[PDB]
């Protein structure tokens, strides 16, 4: 469970993301494609080349949902319900890939918020991503 401390940390770090969420979401995807190629099997239909607008468009979408879970940090299961349904019923991404993206998301933030990416912040953001992932995978079976 996220503590008050965690919640403050996340709101604050995501807070600085601001207007870069989109680009940071794209970057995290690309990192994930390059380091864990199996993840690519879910995007056969995408142009995965560097600067792909498809990727661009998609990272914005992922970032917007993270942004909505931060906005609803106290009711994530309900704010992400719909995305949780999509993933479980249509996309059916194996659960292990959630951990892969979270990881590239943390690398991305680390690379862009040196000043905010503190140990305490790092810990909270990891816990958070883990909670998002848990929600999005909750109705798998």
């Amino acid at each position: 469970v996220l503590s008050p401390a965690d919640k403050t940390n996340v709101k604050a770090a995501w807070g600085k993301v601001g207007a870069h969420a989109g680009e940071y979401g794209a970057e995290a995807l690309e990192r994930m494609f390059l380091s864990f190629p199996t993840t690519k099997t879910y995007f056969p239909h995408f142009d995965l080349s560097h600067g792909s607008a498809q990727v661009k468009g998609h990272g914005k979408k992922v970032a917007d949902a993270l942004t909505n879970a931060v906005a609803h940090v106290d009711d994530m299961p309900n704010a992400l319900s719909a995305l949780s349904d999509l993933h479980a019923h249509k996309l059916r991404v194996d659960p292990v890939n959630f951990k892969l993206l979270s990881h590239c998301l943390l690398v991305t933030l680390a690379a862009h918020l040196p000043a905010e990416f503190t140990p305490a912040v790092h810990a909270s953001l990891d816990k958070f991503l883990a909670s998002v992932s848990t929600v999005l995978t909750s109705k798998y079976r």
Binding site: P37, T38, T41, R92, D94, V96, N97, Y140, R141
Partner: protein, 146 residues
């Protein structure tokens, strides 16, 4: 593989008593029932709405014998799973888009099927050697992903 001759002989010997038809149909179906999300690859098979409809589906039963078929042959090249599965590894990546993690799900399922079947015969030590084989196969199968 990094199998002990003793481990090689245990794998080899149990395999000998295996009905690939029945075991392959059962491994893949259990797969589709325990981990519902792997059905994403088999939409064309029909009705997989229930355990029963999964276990009964002939396309499933038949895909299962094709898979275990191939697995079975890999057991004869236990010293080079890599080269045995290179072509199948590219296929799965480049044509089928199957996430390599599925290779691991199946293996665990296979081991549960073998225990199921062989009861007593499927001892901790015997299980230990099959775990090494499933892992190796999954690894060889994922080897060519890019």
């Amino acid at each position: 593989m990094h199998l002990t001759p003793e481990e090689k002989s245990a794998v080899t010997a149990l395999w000998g008593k295996v009905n690939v038809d029945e075991v392959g149909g059962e491994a893949l179906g259990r797969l589709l029932v325990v981990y519902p999300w792997t059905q994403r690859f088999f939409e064309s098979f029909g009705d997989l709405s229930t355990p029963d409809a999964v276990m009964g589906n002939p396309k499933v039963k038949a895909h299962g014998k094709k898979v275990l078929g191939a697995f079975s042959d890999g057991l004869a090249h236990l010293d080079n799973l890599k080269g045995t599965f290179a072509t199948l590894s590219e296929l799965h990546c480049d044509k089928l888009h199957v996430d390599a993690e599925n290779f691991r799900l199946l293996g665990n399922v296979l081991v549960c099927v073998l225990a199921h079947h062989f009861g007593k015969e499927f001892t901790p030590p015997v299980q230990a050697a099959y775990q090494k084989v499933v892992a190796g196969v999954a690894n060889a199968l994922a080897h060519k992903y890019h």
